[PDB]
Design an enzyme around this catalytic site. Structure first.
Site, PDB file in Angstrom:
ATOM      1  N   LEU A 210     124.756   5.640  55.643  1.00  0.00           N
ATOM      2  CA  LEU A 210     124.086   6.562  56.555  1.00  0.00           C
ATOM      3  C   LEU A 210     123.444   5.798  57.700  1.00  0.00           C
ATOM      4  O   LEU A 210     123.376   6.298  58.822  1.00  0.00           O
ATOM      5  CB  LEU A 210     123.035   7.439  55.834  1.00  0.00           C
ATOM      6  CG  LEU A 210     123.563   8.456  54.831  1.00  0.00           C
ATOM      7  CD1 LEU A 210     122.402   9.221  54.197  1.00  0.00           C
ATOM      8  CD2 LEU A 210     124.576   9.390  55.463  1.00  0.00           C
ATOM      9  N   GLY A 211     122.993   4.597  57.416  1.00  0.00           N
ATOM     10  CA  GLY A 211     122.344   3.747  58.391  1.00  0.00           C
ATOM     11  C   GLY A 211     121.784   2.477  57.809  1.00  0.00           C
ATOM     12  O   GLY A 211     121.781   2.265  56.597  1.00  0.00           O
ATOM     13  N   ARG A 212     121.395   1.593  58.684  1.00  0.00           N
ATOM     14  CA  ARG A 212     120.848   0.296  58.341  1.00  0.00           C
ATOM     15  C   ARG A 212     119.462   0.230  58.959  1.00  0.00           C
ATOM     16  O   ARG A 212     119.224   0.678  60.085  1.00  0.00           O
ATOM     17  CB  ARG A 212     121.798  -0.840  58.821  1.00  0.00           C
ATOM     18  CG  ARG A 212     121.123  -2.060  59.443  1.00  0.00           C
ATOM     19  CD  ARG A 212     121.867  -3.353  59.177  1.00  0.00           C
ATOM     20  NE  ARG A 212     121.791  -3.805  57.780  1.00  0.00           N
ATOM     21  CZ  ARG A 212     120.763  -4.462  57.243  1.00  0.00           C
ATOM     22  NH1 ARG A 212     119.691  -4.742  57.971  1.00  0.00           N
ATOM     23  NH2 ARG A 212     120.804  -4.847  55.974  1.00  0.00           N
ATOM     24  N   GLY A 213     118.557  -0.298  58.179  1.00  0.00           N
ATOM     25  CA  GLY A 213     117.193  -0.485  58.614  1.00  0.00           C
ATOM     26  C   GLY A 213     116.882  -1.953  58.743  1.00  0.00           C
ATOM     27  O   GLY A 213     117.742  -2.822  58.520  1.00  0.00           O
ATOM     28  N   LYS A 214     115.610  -2.208  59.084  1.00  0.00           N
ATOM     29  CA  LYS A 214     114.991  -3.520  59.257  1.00  0.00           C
ATOM     30  C   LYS A 214     115.064  -4.274  57.925  1.00  0.00           C
ATOM     31  O   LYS A 214     115.311  -5.480  57.916  1.00  0.00           O
ATOM     32  CB  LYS A 214     113.511  -3.342  59.698  1.00  0.00           C
ATOM     33  CG  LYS A 214     113.149  -3.901  61.085  1.00  0.00           C
ATOM     34  CD  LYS A 214     111.631  -4.092  61.259  1.00  0.00           C
ATOM     35  CE  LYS A 214     111.222  -5.540  61.485  1.00  0.00           C
ATOM     36  NZ  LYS A 214     109.774  -5.754  61.222  1.00  0.00           N
TER      37      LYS A 214
ATOM     38  N   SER B 152     116.515  -2.439  54.824  1.00  0.00           N
ATOM     39  CA  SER B 152     117.287  -1.641  53.882  1.00  0.00           C
ATOM     40  C   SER B 152     118.578  -1.138  54.465  1.00  0.00           C
ATOM     41  O   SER B 152     118.720  -1.058  55.676  1.00  0.00           O
ATOM     42  CB  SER B 152     116.478  -0.481  53.303  1.00  0.00           C
ATOM     43  OG  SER B 152     116.259   0.533  54.261  1.00  0.00           O
ATOM     44  N   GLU B 153     119.529  -0.800  53.596  1.00  0.00           N
ATOM     45  CA  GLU B 153     120.777  -0.162  53.968  1.00  0.00           C
ATOM     46  C   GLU B 153     120.745   1.142  53.199  1.00  0.00           C
ATOM     47  O   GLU B 153     120.504   1.103  51.991  1.00  0.00           O
ATOM     48  CB  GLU B 153     121.997  -0.999  53.565  1.00  0.00           C
ATOM     49  CG  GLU B 153     122.150  -2.331  54.255  1.00  0.00           C
ATOM     50  CD  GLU B 153     123.613  -2.598  54.514  1.00  0.00           C
ATOM     51  OE1 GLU B 153     124.068  -2.237  55.623  1.00  0.00           O
ATOM     52  OE2 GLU B 153     124.332  -2.938  53.544  1.00  0.00           O
TER      53      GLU B 153
ATOM     54  N   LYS C  48     118.828   3.773  48.819  1.00  0.00           N
ATOM     55  CA  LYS C  48     118.214   2.845  49.780  1.00  0.00           C
ATOM     56  C   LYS C  48     118.222   1.463  49.135  1.00  0.00           C
ATOM     57  O   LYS C  48     117.391   1.145  48.275  1.00  0.00           O
ATOM     58  CB  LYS C  48     116.785   3.310  50.113  1.00  0.00           C
ATOM     59  CG  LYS C  48     116.020   2.452  51.100  1.00  0.00           C
ATOM     60  CD  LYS C  48     114.630   3.020  51.171  1.00  0.00           C
ATOM     61  CE  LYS C  48     113.765   2.270  52.098  1.00  0.00           C
ATOM     62  NZ  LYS C  48     112.490   2.986  52.207  1.00  0.00           N
TER      63      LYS C  48
ATOM     64  N   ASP D  25     103.837   4.721  59.394  1.00  0.00           N
ATOM     65  CA  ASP D  25     105.098   4.732  60.133  1.00  0.00           C
ATOM     66  C   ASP D  25     105.542   6.156  60.431  1.00  0.00           C
ATOM     67  O   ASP D  25     106.710   6.515  60.256  1.00  0.00           O
ATOM     68  CB  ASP D  25     106.179   3.865  59.472  1.00  0.00           C
ATOM     69  CG  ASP D  25     107.352   3.465  60.358  1.00  0.00           C
ATOM     70  OD1 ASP D  25     107.180   3.416  61.602  1.00  0.00           O
ATOM     71  OD2 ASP D  25     108.438   3.195  59.815  1.00  0.00           O
TER      72      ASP D  25
HETATM   73  O1  LIG Z   1     113.769   5.418  53.257  1.00  0.00           O
HETATM   74  C1  LIG Z   1     113.466   6.506  52.653  1.00  0.00           C
HETATM   75  O2  LIG Z   1     112.362   6.798  52.071  1.00  0.00           O
HETATM   76  C2  LIG Z   1     114.487   7.567  52.703  1.00  0.00           C
HETATM   77  C3  LIG Z   1     114.448   8.646  51.812  1.00  0.00           C
HETATM   78  C4  LIG Z   1     115.396   9.650  51.906  1.00  0.00           C
HETATM   79  C5  LIG Z   1     116.389   9.616  52.917  1.00  0.00           C
HETATM   80  C6  LIG Z   1     116.428   8.530  53.828  1.00  0.00           C
HETATM   81  C7  LIG Z   1     115.479   7.500  53.679  1.00  0.00           C
HETATM   82  N1  LIG Z   1     117.326   8.418  54.832  1.00  0.00           N
HETATM   83  C8  LIG Z   1     118.247   9.352  54.994  1.00  0.00           C
HETATM   84  N2  LIG Z   1     119.134   9.218  55.998  1.00  0.00           N
HETATM   85  C9  LIG Z   1     119.289   8.230  56.976  1.00  0.00           C
HETATM   86  C10 LIG Z   1     119.728   8.670  58.237  1.00  0.00           C
HETATM   87  C11 LIG Z   1     119.946   7.774  59.278  1.00  0.00           C
HETATM   88  C12 LIG Z   1     119.747   6.420  59.073  1.00  0.00           C
HETATM   89  C13 LIG Z   1     119.299   5.981  57.832  1.00  0.00           C
HETATM   90 CL1  LIG Z   1     119.017   4.304  57.623  1.00  0.00          CL
HETATM   91  C14 LIG Z   1     119.083   6.869  56.768  1.00  0.00           C
HETATM   92  C15 LIG Z   1     118.317  10.493  54.134  1.00  0.00           C
HETATM   93  C16 LIG Z   1     119.294  11.506  54.279  1.00  0.00           C
HETATM   94  C17 LIG Z   1     119.271  12.585  53.413  1.00  0.00           C
HETATM   95  N3  LIG Z   1     118.395  12.721  52.393  1.00  0.00           N
HETATM   96  C18 LIG Z   1     117.463  11.756  52.260  1.00  0.00           C
HETATM   97  C19 LIG Z   1     117.368  10.618  53.077  1.00  0.00           C
END
Ligand SMILES: O=C(O)c1ccc2c(c1)nc(Nc1cccc(Cl)c1)c1ccncc12
Length: 331
Positions: free
Chosen positions: A44-48, A50-51, A67, A155
């Protein structure tokens, strides 16, 4: 003489009155499942640090999010987990479903509830005045809850607010920067994202609290009602304060610095200049006017303050006239 100390006006000692196990996250014992119960579908995406992947729980066919954490201090992983466990079941807080580890790599991963999100870059432009009020009230439910539970999110920003618009459902995500509030603690100011950093972070005032999240919320509200994303668009942390000062003015900034005996970084002296406090009407135009009202401006004015103590709390914000119609409709 050093900076003047500060205490949160609300939920000040909530952690002191709880057992040490609640907030002493370094002592928390984590029980890791096997990541084999989850089959990754797509990235879904990459973070600082986490992936994030969409996955399927093979045991019940539920769609979840995994995550995968990049290596960070075990201290920091235990903090995110402990905070998520403490907040689990709270209003509009993302649910931590599981904590697993890949059998081979030993990399730790967090499994969350899936939200059918519409990205803010597509969603915000479609929101009505009522929608902004409605979703702001939903974020406030999450913030008042976490603050009441002795936690600062640190954040708050559009990416961290997952909205299933079809179901009018919102979840506050990414608790990786969240921390326990302890009165007198000097925290790291290298938190939040640039555009959402409160002046306390920008001037290096460490004894901050829950009110940090209220500044970030105000930045979100201003970007929504004014259709100017982000609202304060600084090139770096120094210029970020300049962007704020060009709106909120320099008089109140210097009064804030004075009040708390803050030693201001010498480069600010040249860049800040002298600026009047701007009237919110200057940001109103034909394309955003339908989202602006005296109530919205009064509410925004009460969030976007230099002095963190003078900002509305999440509970006070929920009682604001801007939300009167939402509150009526929710009963
Ligand atoms: O980090 C959490 O707490 C966290 C917790 C839940 C989600 C998340 C991150 N990121 C999502 N999506 C996402 C969309 C774009 C980029 C990135 Cl890296 C992630 C996502 C989608 C659907 N349901 C729950 C989540």
């Amino acid at each position: 003489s050093g900076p003047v100390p500060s205490r949160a006006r609300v939920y000040t000692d909530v952690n002191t009155h709880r057992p040490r196990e609640y907030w002493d996250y370094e002592s928390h014992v984590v029980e890791w499942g096997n990541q084999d119960d989850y089959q990754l579908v797509r990235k879904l995406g990459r973070g600082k640090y986490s992936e994030v992947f969409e996955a399927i729980n093979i045991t019940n066919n539920e769609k979840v999010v995994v995550k995968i954490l990049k290596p960070v201090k075990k201290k920091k992983i235990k903090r995110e987990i402990k905070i998520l466990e403490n907040l689990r079941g709270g209003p509009n807080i993302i649910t931590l479903a599981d904590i697993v580890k890949d059998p081979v790599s030993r990399t730790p991963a967090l499994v969350f509830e899936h939200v059918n999100n519409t990205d803010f870059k597509q969603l915000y432009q479609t929101l009505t005045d009522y929608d902004i009020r409605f979703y702001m009230y939903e974020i406030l439910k999450a913030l008042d809850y976490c603050h009441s539970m002795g936690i600062m999110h640190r954040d708050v920003k559009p990416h961290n607010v997952m909205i299933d618009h079809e179901h009018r459902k919102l979840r506050l995500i990414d608790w990786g920067l969240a921390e326990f509030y302890h009165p007198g603690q000097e925290y790291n100011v290298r938190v939040a994202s640039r555009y959402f950093k409160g002046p306390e972070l920008l001037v290096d005032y460490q004894m901050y609290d829950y009110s940090l999240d209220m500044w970030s919320l105000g930045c979100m509200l201003a970007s929504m009602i004014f259709r100017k994303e982000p609202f304060f668009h600084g090139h770096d942390n120094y210029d970020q304060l300049v962007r704020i000062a060009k709106v909120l003015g320099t008089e109140d900034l210097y009064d804030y610095i004075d009040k708390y005996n803050i030693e201001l970084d010498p480069r600010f002296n040249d860049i800040l200049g002298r600026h009047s406090r701007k009237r919110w009407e200057r940001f109103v135009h034909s394309e955003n006017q339908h989202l602006v009202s005296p109530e919205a401006l009064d509410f925004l004015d009460k969030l976007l303050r230099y002095d963190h103590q003078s900002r509305l709390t999440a509970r006070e914000a929920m009682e604001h006239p801007y939300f009167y119609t939402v509150v009526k409709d929710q009963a």
